[PDB]
């Protein structure tokens, strides 16, 4: 069902799954960059990510910030890059949860349009459904094509551990919120991981006694794909802060936190929002999804290219949004499909749900204070990090209590960046509230 | 607590079409000096839509299309506020006009800056009325 391609970054363009590639924010500005299809639809860019940003901000205050501005200058340490993206997408289909994750990633296509298209009609010619791939053949004309695609993963923006998952808004709407669906893209790095210790364990322990973990890089992956997930199907929340009023158990930070993150975490963290809430958003994904149910009872044109087969792509959406059809061939929703498919797009994928299935430690909450990232040794050395078990390898009996994770026993895998970050993670760690 | 947190809006009201107004935002339970600040705006029956945003140092601002060259954004992180210098003020500006705060304190990104889910803390709005 899901194959992880392999190649090289040098590597021939081969106008197949090794392209130059146009991806949406320079859509029409003909920039390049050499990209790598790691499965149907998904896209590898090992580039740093730069819209919105200027140069000098990848260049040189807060240790749970790291910049590098000479990550990914070369092209051995963009094939590194490549190499283990492939090794972490290999790690997510090795069960079936994640492997899942990624079917429902490449089989949710994008609309062929978004708020701005008539009913009646297909527009491929958008930034959130082509990318313009460039075609340079010796002895033929240059020409563009634009093709499909559904995520781009690029390497880091200027700080390197914070990885986002990004959509594509026109004239303050984004297709990714409004049902329709839309290229996801995201800023990862993989070496650079998050640290935390709002965990279980620490709950009335002696400051002595207390557990600091690094993150498996799959899981922060995992983590981001939920959101590209959301994105695809058109169900990112939007405009919808949360604001605590009180600290739970399960907390350890009480800011104010987007509900888009509440759910894609999982775990306790969406049971702050009010019944209230949680019913408008579920009231929302249902108004735009009867909004794509009405386009397809009225499309009757691809505008934008005149090879698209309108029957093939309404039964495509049909899939994807879980629609049933008449004896006239009349779409419409049935709540018992619906409520299922909207139960798997929130509830189904969280990272809390991954990590227990995996097997890896993560954090009890969203809700969790910022520690100083860490730096991994070397993912691509199966001594320290395997597609199987990632860091906990039985092996090493590093399988039990999470131990292949934790700060205070697998030194072997991470190097701390600096004494001033270690020197702040020792006081988060010896730290009494009262 | 999230809760603790307040930035309020002042400096809204009615004008006449051609006329200005300055909004300015005052934050408190927290500091905001190395955070990007916005102004939204909502109309009835709309989303709240970016009007411009400003880098913590104010070194990078960014903002809509719509208002360029009539609208100012500026701040003061002694003083915990951040403004909106609206000159040549048009009835299709009518809005209850907010201030937002990106609450982690990240690099400033043009594209970032206009997304609302950007921002965790927002004032309860002021209104904005432009009559002919």
């Known amino acids: 069902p899901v194959t992880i391609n392999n190649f090289n970054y040098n590597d021939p363009i081969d106008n197949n799954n090794i392209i130059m590639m146009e991806p949406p924010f320079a859509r029409g500005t003909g920039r390049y960059y050499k990209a790598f299809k790691i499965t149907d639809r998904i896209w590898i860019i090992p580039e740093r990510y730069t819209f919105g940003y200027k140069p000098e901000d990848f260049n040189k205050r807060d240790v749970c910030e790291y910049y590098d501005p000479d990550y990914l200058n070369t092209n051995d340490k963009k094939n590194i890059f490549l190499q283990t993206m492939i090794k972490l997408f290999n790690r997510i289909k090795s069960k079936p949860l994640g492997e899942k994750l990624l079917e429902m990633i490449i089989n949710g296509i994008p609309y062929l349009g978004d708020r701005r298209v008539p009913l009646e009609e297909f527009n491929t010619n958008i930034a959130s459904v082509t990318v313009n791939k460039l075609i340079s053949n010796p002895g033929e004309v240059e020409r563009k094509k634009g093709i499909f695609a559904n995520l781009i993963i690029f390497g880091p923006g200027p700080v390197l551990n914070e990885n986002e998952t990004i959509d594509i808004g026109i004239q303050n709407h984004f297709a990714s919120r409004e049902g329709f669906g839309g290229i996801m893209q995201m800023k990862f790095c993989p070496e650079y991981v998050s640290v935390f210790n709002n965990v279980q364990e620490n709950k009335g322990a002696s400051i002595f006694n207390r557990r600091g973990y690094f993150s498996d890089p799959a899981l922060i992956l995992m983590h981001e794909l939920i959101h590209v997930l959301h994105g695809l199907y058109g169900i990112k929340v939007d405009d919808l802060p949360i604001v605590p009023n009180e600290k739970k158990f399960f907390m350890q930070s009480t800011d104010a936190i987007q509900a888009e993150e509440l759910y894609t975490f999982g775990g306790q963290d969406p049971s702050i929002i009010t019944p209230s809430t949680d019913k408008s958003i579920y009231d929302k994904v249902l108004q735009n999804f009867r909004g794509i149910v009405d386009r397809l009872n009225k499309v009757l044109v691809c505008i934008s290219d005149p090879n698209i087969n309108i029957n093939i792509y309404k039964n495509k959406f049909k899939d994807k949004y879980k629609f049933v059809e008449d004896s006239e061939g009349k779409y419409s929703i049935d709540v018992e499909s619906f409520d299922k498919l909207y139960k798997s797009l929130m509830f189904g994928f969280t990272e809390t749900n991954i990590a227990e299935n995996y097997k890896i430690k993560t954090r009890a909450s969203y809700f969790s204070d910022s520690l100083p990232p860490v730096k991994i040794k070397n993912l691509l050395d199966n001594e320290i990090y395997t597609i199987e078990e990632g860091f906990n390898i039985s092996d090493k009996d590093m399988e039990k209590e999470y131990r292949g994770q934790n700060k205070a026993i697998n030194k072997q895998a991470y190097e701390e960046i600096s004494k001033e970050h270690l020197a702040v993670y020792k006081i988060q760690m010896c730290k009494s509230v009262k | 607590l999230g809760s603790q947190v307040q930035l309020v809006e002042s400096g809204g009201g009615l004008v006449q079409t051609g006329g200005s107004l300055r909004l300015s935002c005052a934050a408190s339970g927290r500091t905001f000096r190395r955070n990007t600040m916005g102004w939204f705006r909502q109309a009835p029956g709309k989303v709240r839509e970016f009007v411009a945003a400003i880098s913590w140092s104010g070194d990078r601002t960014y903002c809509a299309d719509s208002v360029k060259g009539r609208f100012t954004i500026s701040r003061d992180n002694a003083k915990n506020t951040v403004d909106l210098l609206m000159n040549s003020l048009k009835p299709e500006d009518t809005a209850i006009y907010y201030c937002?705060?990106?609450?982690?304190?990240?690099?400033?990104?043009?594209?970032?800056?206009?997304?609302?889910?950007?921002?965790?803390?927002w004032g309860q709005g002021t209104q904005v009325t432009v009559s002919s």
């Open positions: 937002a705060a990106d609450g982690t304190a990240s690099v400033f990104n043009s594209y970032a800056s206009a997304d609302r889910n950007k921002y965790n803390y």
